[PDB]
Amino acid sequence: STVTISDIEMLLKDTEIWDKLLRNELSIEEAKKMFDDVARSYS
Amino acid sequence: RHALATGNWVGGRTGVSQLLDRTNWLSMLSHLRRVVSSLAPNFEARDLHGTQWGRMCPFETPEGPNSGLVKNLALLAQVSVGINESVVERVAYEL
């Protein structure tokens, strides 16, 4: 979508990944993979 | 009576008439010889101009915002009363 909307959505996704990782619902490797996926998909 | 009693004058002037200061002899004598500039601004208006020699005192000014804008007459200075321009014009043309 728009650059601003993409930025907002990627910020939200990073927040969700960090929240899930901090609750021990994810491992470090899965969090790394999801962060890479979001960064590549929103570049 | 209202103009003399309030100080608000015609033409936008304010503070023209004040209550005479009678704290002592010098207070009244100095109040009767005070000159206030209508500017009371520019830092050049507060300067001691060399043209003030013998006309305004170089020492009697307030301290602060009104410094340089409220003055006092020198000892021997007077203020001109003026005459009709027509007499001088006739003299100049006849000259």
């Binding site: - | 200061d21 009678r22 704290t23 002592n24 002899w25 010098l26 207070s27 009244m28 004598l29 100095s30 010889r33 020699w53 013998g54 305004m56 005192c57 170089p58 020492f59 009697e60 000014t61 307030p62 301290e63 006092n72 007459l73 020198a74 000892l75 021997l76």
Partner: protein, 98 residues
């Protein structure tokens, strides 16, 4: 030719003794403080009705005079007194403007 070289001053700067030996801002502050002193302001003060008024009980005329003091009538309506002055450090109660 100048009539009177001291006529560059006003009436309050004309009461200062030896004004050319002082720094100028002190001469300026003197003029402000000379309008706040208590003395005799009128000879008929007892029959007047002023909102606020003062009266020094024993006024003196200055021993060190200027030529303008007698012209303006200040020697007949004085606002001060002559004090025996010492310049010394004593007890520490006169430090920094006391």
């Amino acid at each position: 030719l100048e009539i009177w070289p001291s006529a560059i001053l006003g009436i309050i700067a004309s009461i200062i003794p030896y004004p050319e030996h002082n720094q100028s801002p002190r001469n300026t502050y003197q003029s402000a403080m000379a309008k706040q002193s208590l003395g005799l302001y009128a000879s008929n003060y007892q029959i007047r009705t002023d909102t606020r008024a003062h009266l020094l009980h024993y006024p003196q005329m200055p021993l060190v005079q200027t030529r303008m003091l007698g012209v303006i009538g200040y020697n007949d309506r004085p606002a001060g007194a002559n004090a025996i002055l010492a310049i010394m450090s004593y007890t520490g109660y006169n430090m920094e403007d006391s």
